């Protein structure tokens, strides 16, 4: 009576956390080991570590359609943590080969595609090229709908390492030392979540009937913070006040067309989040929000998150 | 009265294992966090995991000489786990700046440079370009000695992941499925060691008076094996005999000059170990062999190592 789960993208940044959260949760956890990563020592040893915790290795390749069909026939639920970084080479769209395999296999009770960010259907007017991420996720969503595959879309929170640990400064992954940039006036609400919590929520929700064919939002109330509130958390932890510089929207987007395309996409996403507030510009009900659905998850607050950087 | 150890290359393949072994040994463990690393999330989070285990971050950059001086002033022993992959960019020689910093600093009881492989003064006859690695490690040894810095040189074993876990097949990091290449007659003795054992021995030797100004060998007796014996260990675990093809020396090296330079070096190193038996063609005393010196370390045998691949 354990739910059988296949994780595809098992050595990814969020993917490896989902693997471990599925194991802790008690799911019979299967991981797709692709032959193409056989010389990447950190991926190979990750898989060895998953085995020591009870994960079952499933060999398959996205170029071998029958291998993907065999893989998904072993489980009840599939979770994809496919990368989003190389949008111009359409790695989100690689998931379409998995959707086809799931359709042909017929047995999968639920599929969680690689979402875990902003809510794609709400991003219709996003800045290009950053817009491209949402199109591709939307194209995968439509592939899911057309095949009639039951689904859950996990959305709504900034990964804490990429937007809280650095006080949203972008240029590193650590808090700044003396000066900090405030984007806009810094009073736009942002949703931050420890990625291990996002992983726990994913493992709780993937066999929850309440979230069958639903969008689940990850919006822990204590972690809805403006950028200045985030900065003040850190200033209280350190005892030192940071010299602040406000950066107006127009100066943030200045000369964006001269940046490299990936940085252009990253700047666009940041703008929607921190200037327009896309993660908080709408309300969601407790019946579709993960912290209320799963109250036993004592999610990590941003003041406990930032302590590890002291 | 704890030994203060600084690790340079702390997020490296063997380096991160060294950090953890030093902590488990009880040393006061410092790790050099370089600013150039600040956007590589996996390194940033390794440093955070090290802190949680009690390591002390020490910021420094190889391009800031006095940051290196300051770092090395803090400790009694320095361990370098500098990379050896980019020998055409001389990254092994980057250690020379660290040696200058230790010389200026004057306080360092013992320096362990980035050795952990073939015994470099024994490789004067190695094939190019593969020999460049040992040349550069020799130049580092010179600077250490020319500056009077006390040292321990840790040498003599193949990293198990790169040469045991794949049955020495090179093309993958996992055992082969049905066929295996036997190099020569497969009767040449090779030394294999789990890299966590290599790190444990490193941590136990860095303040051992017996190994001050000595080369210490990692040659655990049950792990001195021919490639054929290694293969037969795997066949006994799986109950499947592999189909064997022997590759003669001349054919192994054929057309080496048409391969990419890093692969050329990889082949040359492999030849000395597996064809020429460079790791086992000489005798070493128990007083200069780590498994004798540190008999409390119950080193992993290659049958236990390979079990994790089943
Ligand atoms: N703040 C937020 O909310 C953020 C959200 N995200 C989103 O999370 C999801 C995953 O992103 P992330 O964890 O950073 O991804 P990663 O960059 O860590 O890649 C994850 C996995 O993608 C697989 N992968 C990459 N390329 C291919 C390919 N050509 N073919 C097959 N598999 C491939 C690999 O699986 P394998 O393990 O098999 O090798 C890889 O491990 C995305 O949808 C992303 O947009 C990401 C960062 C921030
Ligand atoms: N079978 C055997 O016996 C083998 C032995 N070895 C040897 O082990 C030793 C370490 O190798 P390995 O663990 O694979 O190395 P890695 O490839 O893991 O690199 C280790 C560290 O080197 C640092 N580094 C790399 N380039 C630079 C640079 N330009 N400037 C400053 N620092 C740099 C980085 O330290 P940081 O953490 O600060 O970023 C990196 O993490 C070498 O001597 C190698 O020859 C290697 C593999 C097989």
Report which bound ligand comes closest to the CA of A198: 1
**Three-state secondary structure along B227-291?**
HHHHHHHHHHHHCCCCEEEEECHHHHCCCHHHCCHHHHHHHHHHHHHHHCCCCCCCCCCHHHEHH
**For residue A13, which residues of chain B lie inside 8 Å, CB to CB?**
41
Interface size between A and B, measured as CB pairs under 8 A: 38
| Nearest-atom index, ligand 2, CA of B86 | 26
Q: Do B173 and A52 touch (CB under 8 A)?
A: no
Beta partners for residue B247, in sequence order: B183
**What is B57-85 written as a DSSP string?**
EEE--TT-HHHHHHHHHT-SEEEE----S
In angstroms, rounded to a whole number, what is the distance separating the alpha carbons of residues B291 and B221? Answer: 8
First-residue to last-residue Cα distance in chain A: 44
CB B195 within 8 A of CB B117: no
Q: Coil, helix or strand for B297?
A: coil
Structure-token pair, residue B226? 């021919």
Answer whether A159 touches B (CB < 8 Å): no
Q: Is B116's C-beta closer than 6 angstroms to any atom of ligand 2?
A: yes
Omega cis (within 30) before A129: yes
Q: Do B172 and A51 touch (CB under 8 A)?
A: no
> Of A166, A150, A158, which Cα lies nearest the Cα of A113?
A150
| Nearest-atom index, ligand 2, CA of B81 | 10
Q: Do B41 and A173 touch (CB under 8 A)?
A: yes
Q: What is residue B141's DSSP assignment?
A: H
Q: Which residues line ligand 1 (CB under 6 A)?
A: A 9-15, 32, 34, 37, 43, 62, 81-85, 91, 94, 114, 116-117, 157-159, 162
Closest partner CB to B39 (pick from A13, A44, A173): A173
Among A137, A200, A204, A300, the one annotated catalytic: A137
In angstroms, rounded to a whole number, what is the distance separating the alpha carbons of residues B272 and B130? Answer: 10
Residue of A45, A65, A82 to test ligand 1 pocket, by largest number of atoms within 8 Å of CB: A82
Mutate which: A39, A46, A194, A266, vs B, most B CBs within 10 A: A39
Structure-token pair, residue B106? 């004057």
CB B151 within 8 A of CB B80: no
- Buried b / exposed e along A133-152 (16+ C-beta atoms within 10 A): bbbbbebbbebbeeeebebb
CB B121 within 8 A of CB B138: yes
> Of B142, B125, B100, B88, which Cα lies nearest the Cα of B281?
B125
Q: Is B275's C-beta closer than 6 angstroms to any atom of ligand 2?
A: no
Q: Do A173 and B38 touch (CB under 8 A)?
A: yes
Q: Do A39 and B13 touch (CB under 8 A)?
A: no
In angstroms, rounded to a whole number, what is the distance separating the alpha carbons of residues A230 and A283? Answer: 21
In angstroms, rounded to a whole number, what is the distance separating the alpha carbons of residues B79 and B203? Answer: 9
To the nearest 10 degrees (0 to 180), the angle between helices A131-147 and A261-274 is 80
Structure-token pair, residue B207? 């303040």
A137 included as an active-site residue:
yes
Report which bound ligand comes closest to the CA of B115: 2
**For residue A172, which residues of chain B lie inside 8 Å, CB to CB?**
38-39
Q: Please give the helix or strand (H or E) that residue B135 lies within, else none.
A: helix B131-146
In angstroms, rounded to a whole number, what is the distance separating the alpha carbons of residues A159 and A169? Answer: 14
Beta partners for residue A214, in sequence order: A152
Instruction: Tell me the nearest-neighbour CA distance from A83 into chain B, angstroms.
Output: 15
Q: Do B39 and A309 touch (CB under 8 A)?
A: no
Residue B238, annotated as binding a ligand: no
The structure was resolved experimentally with X-ray
> Resolution limit in angstroms?
2.0
Q: Do B172 and A38 touch (CB under 8 A)?
A: yes
In angstroms, rounded to a whole number, what is the distance separating the alpha carbons of residues A168 and A182? Answer: 9
Q: Across the beta sheet with B77-80, what order do the strands follow?
A: B56-59, B28-33, B4-8, B77-80, B110-112
In this structure, which residue's CA is closest to atom 25 in ligand 2?
A: B83
In angstroms, rounded to a whole number, what is the distance separating the alpha carbons of residues A157 and A220? Answer: 9
In angstroms, rounded to a whole number, what is the distance separating the alpha carbons of residues A54 and A213? Answer: 29
Answer whether B45 touches A (CB < 8 Å): yes
Q: Please give the helix or strand (H or E) that residue B199 lies within, else none.
A: helix B195-205
Residue B137, annotated as binding a ligand: yes
Q: Coil, helix or strand for B53?
A: coil
In angstroms, rounded to a whole number, what is the distance separating the alpha carbons of residues A150 and B123? Answer: 62
Instruction: Tell me the nearest-neighbour CA distance from A152 into chain B, angstroms.
Output: 28
Q: Coil, helix or strand for B133?
A: helix
In angstroms, rounded to a whole number, what is the distance separating the alpha carbons of residues A19 and A203? Answer: 9
Instruction: Tell me the nearest-neighbour CA distance from B48 into chain A, angstroms.
Output: 7
Structure-token pair, residue A278? 């896309």
Centre a 10 Å sphere on the Cβ of residue B234 and count the other Cβ atoms it contains.
22
CB A158 within 8 A of CB A118: no
**Three-state secondary structure along chain A?**
CCCEEEEECCCCHHHHHHHHHHHHHCCEEEEEECHHHCCCHHHHHHHHHHHHCCCEEEECCCCCHHHHHHHHCCCCEEEECCCCCCHHHCCHHHHHHHHHHHHHHCCCCEEECCCCCCCHHHCCCCCCCCHHHHHHHHHHHHHHHHHCCCEEEEECCEEHHHHCCCCCCCCCCCCCCCEEEEEECCCCEEEEECHHHHHHHHHHHCCCHHHCCEEEECCCHHHEEEHHHHHHHHHHHHCCCCEEEEECHHHHHCCHHHCCHHHHHHHHHHHHHHCCCCCCCCCCCHHHEHHHHCCCCCCCCHHHHHHCCC
Sequence-distant (6+) residues with CB within 8 A of B123 are B131, B134, B272, B278
User: B250 exposed, middle or buried (CB, 10 Å; 0-12, 13-18, 19+)?
Assistant: exposed
> Of B74, B48, B21, which Cα lies nearest the Cα of B194?
B21
Q: Do A172 and B39 touch (CB under 8 A)?
A: yes
Structure-token pair, residue B99? 């040696």
In this structure, which residue's CA is closest to atom 38 in ligand 2?
A: B9
Residue of B nearest to A45 (CA): B161
In this structure, which residue's CA is closest to atom 15 in ligand 1?
A: A83
Q: Coil, helix or strand for B156?
A: coil
Sequence-distant (6+) residues with CB within 8 A of B146 are none
In angstroms, rounded to a whole number, what is the distance separating the alpha carbons of residues B308 and B310? Answer: 6
Residue of B58, B84, B123 to test ligand 2 pocket, by largest number of atoms within 8 Å of CB: B84
């Amino acid at each position: 009576e354990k739910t059988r789960v296949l994780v595809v993208g098992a050595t990814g940044y969020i993917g490896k956390r989902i693997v471990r959260a599925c194991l802790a949760e008690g799911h019979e956890t299967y991981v797709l080991q692709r032959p193409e990563i056989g010389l990447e020592i950190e991926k190979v040893q990750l898989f060895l570590s998953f085995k020591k915790l009870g994960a079952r290795i499933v060999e398959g390749s996205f170029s071998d359609h029958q291998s993907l069909v065999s893989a998904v026939k072993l489980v009840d639920v599939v979770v994809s943590a496919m990368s989003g970084v190389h949008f111009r080479s359409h790695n989100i769209l690689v998931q379409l080969k998995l959707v086809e395999a799931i359709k042909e296999a017929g047995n999968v009770k639920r599929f969680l595609p690689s979402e875990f960010g902003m809510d794609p259907p709400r991003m219709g007017h996003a800045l290009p090229p950053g817009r491209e991420t949402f199109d591709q996720k939307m194209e995968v969503r439509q592939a899911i709908e057309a095949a009639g595959i039951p689904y859950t879309y996990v959305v709504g929170a900034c990964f804490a390492a990429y937007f809280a640990g650095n006080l949203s400064q972008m240029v590193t992954l650590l808090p700044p030392k003396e000066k900090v940039n405030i984007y806009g006036d810094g009073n736009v609400k942002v949703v931050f979540a420890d990625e291990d919590d996002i992983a726990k929520y994913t493992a709780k929700t993937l066999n929850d009937p309440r979230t069958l064919n639903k969008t689940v939002n990850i919006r822990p109330p204590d972690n809805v913070l403006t950028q200045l509130e985030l900065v003040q958390i850190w200033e209280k932890l350190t005892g030192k006040e940071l010299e602040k510089t406000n950066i107006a929207a127009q100066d943030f987007l200045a000369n964006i067309e001269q940046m490299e395309i990936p940085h252009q996409a990253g700047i666009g996403h940041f703008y929607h989040i921190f200037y327009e507030g896309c993660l908080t510009d709408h309300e969601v009900g407790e019946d579709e929000e993960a912290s209320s659905l799963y109250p036993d998850v004592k999610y990590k607050r941003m003041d406990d998150y930032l302590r590890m950087f002291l």
